Amino acid sequence: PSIAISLCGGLSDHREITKDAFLEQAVSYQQFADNPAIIDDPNLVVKVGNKYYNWTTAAPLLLAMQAFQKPLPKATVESIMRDKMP
Amino acid sequence: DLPSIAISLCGGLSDHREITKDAFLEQAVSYQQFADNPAIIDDPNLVVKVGNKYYNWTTAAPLLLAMQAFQKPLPKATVESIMRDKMP
Ligand SMILES: [Cl-]
Ligand SMILES: [Cl-]
Ligand SMILES: [Cl-]
Ligand SMILES: [Cl-]
Ligand SMILES: [Cl-]
Ligand SMILES: [Cl-]
Ligand SMILES: [Cl-]
Ligand SMILES: [Cl-]
Ligand SMILES: [Cl-]
Ligand SMILES: [Cl-]
Ligand SMILES: [Cl-]
Ligand SMILES: [Zn+2]
Ligand SMILES: [Zn+2]
Ligand SMILES: [Zn+2]
Ligand SMILES: [Zn+2]
Ligand SMILES: [Zn+2]
Ligand SMILES: [Zn+2]
Ligand SMILES: [Zn+2]
Ligand SMILES: [Zn+2]
């Protein structure tokens, strides 16, 4: 899946993330390299495919894809979102 | 192109013990183990191997995000600074 990060926010207010708002505050590589603490920003949104996650939800999804070269099961993702999404 | 990642619950980084190949692999986390317990990511004993080096989760997290989101690892000088801030 395509993956990107942005500081648009809106997840904790359960706001729908629009492509336009996401892109207006997308984080570039150099920007993240200059300030890696961005990973802890409350407004950080992670785009994974068509969905938008907070970092706490995206982290296991992402860790699994790189460590095992395949996504987690569908039932696992549902459980992570249930546990971790705002 | 991206470096390989493995995870283990061998621990030892925060006591500054040397991470041995045997200790890492004997307690390596498998796909089904992580799929059954994704909270392992918060386990205090989690060690993340990135290429040749061993990190705790707090250090590995930005490395992992940069690789996935930008499809390239962070610069080496950046990783060194993350280590100073986040390694135990
Ligand atoms: Cl912000
Ligand atoms: Cl379903
Ligand atoms: Cl279902
Ligand atoms: Cl979870
Ligand atoms: Cl949980
Ligand atoms: Cl240990
Ligand atoms: Cl534990
Ligand atoms: Cl445990
Ligand atoms: Cl443990
Ligand atoms: Cl120390
Ligand atoms: Cl210490
Ligand atoms: Zn902020
Ligand atoms: Zn389902
Ligand atoms: Zn959980
Ligand atoms: Zn100890
Ligand atoms: Zn444990
Ligand atoms: Zn250096
Ligand atoms: Zn820092
Ligand atoms: Zn220490």
Residue numbers in the entry:
A (entry chain B): 463 to 548
B (entry chain A): 461 to 548
Authors' text:
Lipins are magnesium-dependent phosphatidic acid phosphatases (PAPs) that catalyze the dephosphorylation of the membrane lipid phosphatidic acid (PA) to produce diacylglycerol (DAG). Our principal findings are that the M-Lip domain is a new protein fold that forms a dimer, binds membranes, and can affect lipin PAP activity, oligomerization, subcellular localization, and adipogenesis. Phospholipid synthesis and fat storage as triglycerides are regulated by lipin phosphatidic acid phosphatases (PAPs), whose enzymatic PAP function requires association with cellular membranes.
We, therefore, truncated the M-Lip domain of mouse lipin 1 to remove the C-terminal cluster of hydrophobic and basic residues implicated in membrane binding by HDX-MS. We refer to this construct as the M-Lipxtal domain. The structure of the M-Lipxtal domain of mouse lipin 1 was determined to resolutions of 1.5 Å and 1.9 Å in two unique space groups. Phases were obtained using single-wavelength anomalous diffraction from selenomethionine (SeMet)-derivatized protein. The M-Lip domain of mouse lipin 1 and lipin 2 formed a symmetric or near symmetric dimer in all three crystal forms with a root mean square deviation for all atoms ranging between 0.36–0.77 Å. The observation of near identical dimers in three different crystal structures strongly suggested the native quaternary structure of the M-Lip domain as dimeric. Analysis of the dimer interface of the M-Lip revealed an extensive network of interactions between the two subunits with residues within the α3 helix, which was located in the center of the dimer, mediating the majority of these interactions. SEC-MALS reported a MW of 25.6 ± 0.6 kDa for the mouse lipin 1 M-Lipxtal domain, which was consistent with the MW of 26 kDa for a M-Lipxtal dimer.
